[PDB]
Design a protein around this ligand. Sequence first.
Ligand code: HEM
Ligand code: HEM
Lengths: 106, 112, 33, 22, 379, 48, 62
Amino acid sequence: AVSASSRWLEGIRKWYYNAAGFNKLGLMRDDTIHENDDVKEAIRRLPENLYDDRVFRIKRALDLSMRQQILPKEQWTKYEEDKSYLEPYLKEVIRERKEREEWAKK
Amino acid sequence: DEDAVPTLSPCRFTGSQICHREDGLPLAHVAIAVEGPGWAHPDNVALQVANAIIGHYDCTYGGGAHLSSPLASIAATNKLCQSFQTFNICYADTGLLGAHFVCDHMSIDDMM
Amino acid sequence: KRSVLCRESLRGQAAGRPLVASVSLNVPASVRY
Amino acid sequence: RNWVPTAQLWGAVGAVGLVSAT
Amino acid sequence: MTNIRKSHPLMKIVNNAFIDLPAPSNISSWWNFGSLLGICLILQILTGLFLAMHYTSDTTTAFSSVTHICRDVNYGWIIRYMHANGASMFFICLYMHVGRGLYYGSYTFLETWNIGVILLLTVMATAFMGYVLPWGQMSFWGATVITNLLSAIPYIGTNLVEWIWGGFSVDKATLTRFFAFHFILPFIIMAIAMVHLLFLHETGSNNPTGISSDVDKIPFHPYYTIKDILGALLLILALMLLVLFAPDLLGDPDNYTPANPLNTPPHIKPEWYFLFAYAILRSIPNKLGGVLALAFSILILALIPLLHTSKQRSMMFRPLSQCLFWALVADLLTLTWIGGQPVEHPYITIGQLASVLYFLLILVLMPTAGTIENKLLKW
Amino acid sequence: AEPEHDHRKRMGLKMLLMMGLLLPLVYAMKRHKWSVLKSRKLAYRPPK
Amino acid sequence: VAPTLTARLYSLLFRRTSTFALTIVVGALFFERAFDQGADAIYEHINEGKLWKHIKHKYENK
Ligand code: HEM
Ligand code: HEM
């Protein structure tokens, strides 16, 4: 029955998004996950463009964290553009795992 | 003399690097050089005799390990490189002088 | 490998005495015609 | 070759070092 | 290979761990504490051996021997003070190392962290015994109070406490034991430190961002050797500023009074490094409940890993986490304040709430905040 | 109580001056080397 | 033209590390002595007549 409440989370979400500074660093959510076993496989399934692109952005952002400088206001990731490009890839990875776990009960 | 304004004005010497990574390529190309003299200079034949010593080597050189240039000998013996070559790039106002080597991704540092 | 896309092609083999002459030298090495 | 010269400065250094240091 | 010094001797290759090791580029200045942590331990050792070279481990002499060290022995005065203040620095550093594990989630290195806790508890044993060494009023009563705390254990405790002391009080036997334990502990520690290094060398360092930096690595030698050296300069500056111009400042305990086995430590307390635990301890009425919750303050650390809730091993991009992280640090500050406080109402009620806060922050608040942040990001 | 009171404070003087020469020097050394990295600039050029 | 003080210093003493060390050995010596002499003086100025050095006169040789 979410019309008021779940059309307003976008506001805390939006507030939160830019609150976490990765925003500023040129980075995108997908590029911030913890690199574990599922995430790895997922990353290994990324097409060359998608994947070279994450490499550049972490290469840009770590560059910046080294120098403690934030990117220009002009050049910052905008919440409206949430490329959850890993999500697709990540999901199955997980999906395949859970199955593999489940098939292993009896 | 109003022509005298050198059209051949020195070019400023800069010790930088430009690294352009492409793990999609099989071998590695490195050109390392320090700045040298122009075309005309006593030091400039002496340099050549010094590059004579280092030499220049290829996958196909018949003498590999018995080459006399210890650089050659070492890449021959230890499969350190595919092909290397010293050069002295003579220009008016400046130069480029050093080696250039091609090798595996796991060999760059020993070659250097 | 060197890209062979344009008009530039001009390789075809036929010399006087020597034909398909391959050399292996102690220093240099190659393949001519 | 250049070793004598260099060994000579290296010998100097150890000397003055002891002398002073010690 | 030929005549590549480093790989030639096998032993010398093992040292390239400090030169040719891939080191993250981006990297707060809170990464020098590790290296400082290790200079500390060498500093103590050195200094220590020297003190041990003129110190006597007996009830009659100990205080005298200390006192002789800082009067008739040449430069025996700085060495000793340097040694005492050293141990404040070693702890100061210690807590910086951990604060960072906590914050950037370095403890994702399951195995490396574990050894860290082991290390951390192993320095604590050493600092607890050495303080006893001089045999001052403070040392004599705190050693009694703390080891007797152990007698809270129901079936054994009592027998135990007596075996530790090697008698029914803390006379010779006890004192001689601490000396020996103090001595060898740090050598045992150094093996551990090195095993610690060993496990970390398999995965590398983490960073502010909290993302892999293999795409961005840097040779340790060129950079980080300079950084470490500079950090050591800053480290040594703090130690000497404190040693040379504020000798006991930090050493709260003024008790330079040989210990008379029947007297009154108005307000007896471990040094700064242990106040948190102390506070924690008083908050419980029952003495066994206090010991367990004294043990848990410190051991809690071994579960952090299993409390991690987010998808971002880096608190850096997570604001609610940052806020509680800091709180707990200030809570922790607050707890150290209680440590020097009289036993009374005001401090009791405060300390009580601060203990609760402290386990809440580590046990329940943070973890929730983790999920919340993850939901906000739609993760 | 503290015999070493005077030596100590003289030492503090020499440790402060010295450290006022080494902290600024060694910081320099640190920027000397690092400069390579901090001055560095990137460029990304896919075939794409 | 002449070499900047640095360049002079450079080509005389730093090119060869053997010379560079030597330098350092000798400067470590010279520097100790001025530092101490200066630094000591400085210190002793701040506590004029406070230190025995200043006060040995009262009970010395009559
Ligand atoms: C490595 C961890 C160490 C820590 C945390 C540590 C800490 C301490 C502390 C806090 C004291 C009390 C001194 C005072 O406040 O009067 C002390 C004393 C002493 N320590 Fe250490 N120390 C360490 C290592 C060593 C080592 C390796 C040795 C010798 C091998 C050593 C030998 C001594 C001796 C003989 C004393 C007694 C004289 C004195 O009070 O200075 N310690 N230590
Ligand atoms: C004797 C005490 C210790 C010594 C000598 C020591 C030494 C070091 C050194 C040299 C480093 C590498 C540089 C750095 O990461 O800062 C390091 C990293 C680390 N230490 Fe320790 N440490 C000690 C105590 C601890 C403690 C008490 C913990 C946690 C309880 C700990 C956990 C870690 C972790 C998690 C890392 C790696 C984090 C990362 O760089 O990603 N260490 N330690």
